């Protein structure tokens, strides 16, 4: 996968530039650019989404669109400062299609193959940042570190620890913020509160 493209450095700027030249799977072709993680190596909390979406692919930054604004609202309710986080995604190139009459590029799910191909960047990020806790936002991120059979819905609120993860950080798997954007008002509000709960669990680690 991406392993030959990952240089022997923990400097995030060098890692990010190297990711721009990655060909570890096919996703680099149609994306605009790689979207590396944002934040600094002093971060105690790392958060991992699925992939850059439409806005991120062009902004060059993770979580800048509607799922990002909802995450900001949850972080602020959890009194977590986003500037103090390291925020990234399991795959670094936007996988997408267009529908006729659609108003945006639509994200397509990364295959497990692509996730495994890109995981070396995630490993380099964790080795570089040495977070105390990793928040996994959604199924793809959670499976990247916890195994392909892992179910986010069955482990809400739980602090996890697995053996093949750099520095043995605490892991907290939670709902993807994109899932909180749609549905009945009451279901959204209860899901938002659970997101805030899971963020508080990670920060109290
Ligand atoms: O950075 C982003 C934006 C949207 N969705 C994700 O999973 N990550
Ligand atoms: S998605 Fe990841 S592995 Fe695939 S080309 Fe982009 S950076 Fe490399």
Numbering used by the authors: 3 to 207
Q: Please, what does the article write about this entry?
A:
UdgX excises uracil from uracil-containing DNA to concurrently form a covalent bond with the resulting AP-DNA. Structurally, UdgX is highly similar to family-4 UDGs (F4-UDGs). However, UdgX is unique in possessing a flexible R-loop (105KRRIH109). Our earlier studies allowed us to propose a reaction mechanism of UdgX, which involves the formation of a covalent bond between H109 of UdgX with the C1′ position of the target deoxyribose sugar concurrently with the uracil excision from this site in DNA.
Substitutions of His109 in MsmUdgX with Ser, Gly, Ala, Gln, Cys and Lys showed the loss of its covalent complex formation with DNA but gained canonical UDG activities. However, H109 substitutions by Gln or Lys, showed poor activity. Both Cys and Ala mutations of H109 showed intermediate Kcat/Km values. However, to better understand the mechanism of uracil excision by the H109 mutants, we determined their structures along with a pentameric DNA, TTUTT by X-ray crystallography. The DNA backbone could not be modelled into the experimental electron density map in any of the mutant structures that were determined. Nonetheless, all structures revealed the excised uracil and the side chain substitutions at position 109. The structures also revealed invariant interactions of N91 and H178 with uracil. When we arranged the mutants in the order of increasing cavity sizes (left), we noted that the canonical UDG activity of the mutants increased with their increasing cavity sizes to begin with and then with a further increase in the cavity size, the UDG activity declined (right). It suggested that the initial increase in UDG activity (H109K to H109Q to H109G) occurred because of the efficiency with which the water molecule could be localized to make a nucleophilic attack on the C1′ position. However, a further increase in the cavity size (H109S to H109C to H109A) perhaps destabilizes the bound water, thereby decreasing the UDG activity.
